[PDB]
Design a protein around this ligand. Structure first.
Ligand SMILES: NC(=O)c1ccc[n+]([C@@H]2O[C@H](COP(=O)([O-])OP(=O)(O)OC[C@H]3O[C@@H](n4cnc5c(N)ncnc54)[C@H](OP(=O)(O)O)[C@@H]3O)[C@@H](O)[C@H]2O)c1
Ligand SMILES: NC(=O)c1ccc[n+]([C@@H]2O[C@H](COP(=O)([O-])OP(=O)(O)OC[C@H]3O[C@@H](n4cnc5c(N)ncnc54)[C@H](OP(=O)(O)O)[C@@H]3O)[C@@H](O)[C@H]2O)c1
Ligand SMILES: Nc1nc(O)c(N)c(NC(=O)Nc2ccc(C(=O)N[C@@H](CCC(=O)O)C(=O)O)cc2)n1
Lengths: 295, 285
């Protein structure tokens, strides 16, 4: 009885399809309404361009007007701040994000920039005000970072209720681990948060009916650790050379999939699990902001 | 045979003495300067009146100027917002707080009222900005809620390092449980948070090398559940007054335990005073 596979590519495809239908219907119910997203970029990083173009493409297909503002490497902190204030003030923009890391020849305080974003438009959900609402239970209107938001969606796709179950989160970063704990707690699971200072991590992990790993340590969580019948969500994206792959490298998660798939009731593969869910989640957060503004 | 008693009344007395001397030196450095704290109350609850009096009394003794504003029960959210704005703008007020729960005959959104407070004067650390910094590990920039702070201080009095320990927090409120989890997590403990929907609460509590209970349910946490040699922190104030932990039984299993009363509560007021003296000092800096 091996684990059922949570196909993030298929699930995300469905989500994006539904968001398109939702966006079409919003526009028809309120003629003139245009759900709008804006992405602020500083510099010209190769990886950022690729990530941005993918977000813009997903946006246009769903019918969300996506605006890309690209500032030069010569940009200063005050200029970035000026744009954030203008985006906050632009009533035609429902949500926006600052693509990180910033690429400038000048010293720019990333944290101050991010925290200048109006909470009601913070689709990436990384502002302190937003992290604060999420951490304290205001799940009804706050924004949720794309990765942990995708993880909860995958857990819910199993059909197994979260309330009363013991969830274990390995990792406590701002991007994944911390907000992941928040989602699980407010969905009434009993949560245990582990990290690099956690003793007997194997014994801790073995207590999780729901396990979310986001450590960046390739295949560290062995299958032996997994509790029988657990839901395993793996956020790991670790590259390893493999001449037998089309591009000479394979992607492995933070969980030892091959042995974990025999223990778990549900598991996310890598690649193809949590990864494909992220852009859809941002799109979902953008539609949410648009609907809240509309009301 | 029983657990060592964590005397919050004696420990808070030492903190208050330290704070008083700091305030005295600060006034000697800048004669005329006076740290000021303001407490905004809505309604006239008997328990809130006594709690505020304790805070006012600890302040006066430390040398802090404390102002108490009491609004009638007919107060609207709109009116509370006016005073908050006034307190935010009053340069002489370094730190203020809104006493909870608000006692009004009208609906007042508590999160909106609390989030109207300027983060630099949020000594209670209840704003989403302060909660968000704590929730993500940014401890250089924020005010932590007074109860969690007092508890952390009590845990440290045992001398036992927090790092690596499995901590269990029973309760998840914005005032105690949620921020208590954050303090333990960022102090490197492995943390499990329990609430009313937790199944087999006894098995969860048994895993705690450090146990903090803040449920408001009289002696619900049984001593049987306590892990031998555990540090037990009881935030409960339940009506005789008893904690959320069955003390007599728990004391025979724990290594360190907080009594009720005289445990967490005096520590809560001392920490509030510490945050206040801090908000006055950051103002001068
Ligand atoms: N789908 C996506 O596109 C997506 C998005 C974001 C992230 N990810 C992936 O998720 C992973 C996690 O990223 P991150 O944001 O969380 O970065 P990170 O800052 O490196 O997070 C590591 C966290 O896990 C803890 N940790 C480090 N080694 C561990 C170990 N050996 N055992 C137990 N805990 C360990 C660390 O604790 P300390 O706090 O003590 O250091 C830290 O909290 C990355 O591999 C990334 O590829 C994927
Ligand atoms: N010493 C001080 O100065 C000080 C300061 C503040 C508070 N306190 C004391 O701390 C206590 C709790 O305050 P609070 O803000 O946390 O109150 P609260 O808002 O009522 O929160 C109670 C929490 O405990 C959970 N809970 C309820 N019954 C439980 C049960 N049977 N098993 C496990 N969890 C249970 C609830 O879960 P749900 O979220 O699911 O409902 C809730 O999260 C009070 O007695 C208060 O007197 C003392
Ligand atoms: N929302 C809300 N809920 C609560 O339960 C409390 N208590 C609160 N605010 C508050 O100020 N709490 C508080 C509680 C106790 C003390 C206190 O000093 N308690 C002492 C003993 C007091 C006594 O003699 O009864 C203690 O030892 O616990 C101070 C503040 N805020």
């Amino acid at each position: 009885a091996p684990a059922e596979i949570l196909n993030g590519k298929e699930i995300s495809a469905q989500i994006r399809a539904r968001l398109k239908n939702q966006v079409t219907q919003l526009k028809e119910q309120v003629p003139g309404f245009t759900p709008r997203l804006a992405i602020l970029q500083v510099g010209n990083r190769d990886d950022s361009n690729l990530y941005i173009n993918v977000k813009l493409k997903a946006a246009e297909e769903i019918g969300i007007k996506a605006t890309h503002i690209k500032l030069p490497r010569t940009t200063t902190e005050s200029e970035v701040m000026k744009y954030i204030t203008s985006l906050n003030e632009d009533s035609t923009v429902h949500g926006f994000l600052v693509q990180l890391p910033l690429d400038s020849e000048n010293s720019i305080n990333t944290e101050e920039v991010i925290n200048a974003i109006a909470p009601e438009k913070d689709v990436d959900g990384l502002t302190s005000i937003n992290a604060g609402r999420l951490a304290r239970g205001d799940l009804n209107d706050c924004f949720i970072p794309c990765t942990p938001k995708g993880c909860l969606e995958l857990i819910k796709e199993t059909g197994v209720p979260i309330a009363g179950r013991h969830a274990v989160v390995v990792g406590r970063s701002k991007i994944v681990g911390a907000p992941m704990h928040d989602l699980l707690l407010w969905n009434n699971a009993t949560v245990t948060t582990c990290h690099s200072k956690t003793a007997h991590l194997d014994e801790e992990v073995n207590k999780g009916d729901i396990l979310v790993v986001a450590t960046g340590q390739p295949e560290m969580v062995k299958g032996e650790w997994i509790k029988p019948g657990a839901i395993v969500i793996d956020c790991g994206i670790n590259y390893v050379p493999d001449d037998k792959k089309p591009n000479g490298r394979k992607v492995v998660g933070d969980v030892a999939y091959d042995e974990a798939k025999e223990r778990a009731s549900f598991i996310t593969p890598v690649p193809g699990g949590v990864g494909p869910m992220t852009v859809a989640m941002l799109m979902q957060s953008t539609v949410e902001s648009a609907k809240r503004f509309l009301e």
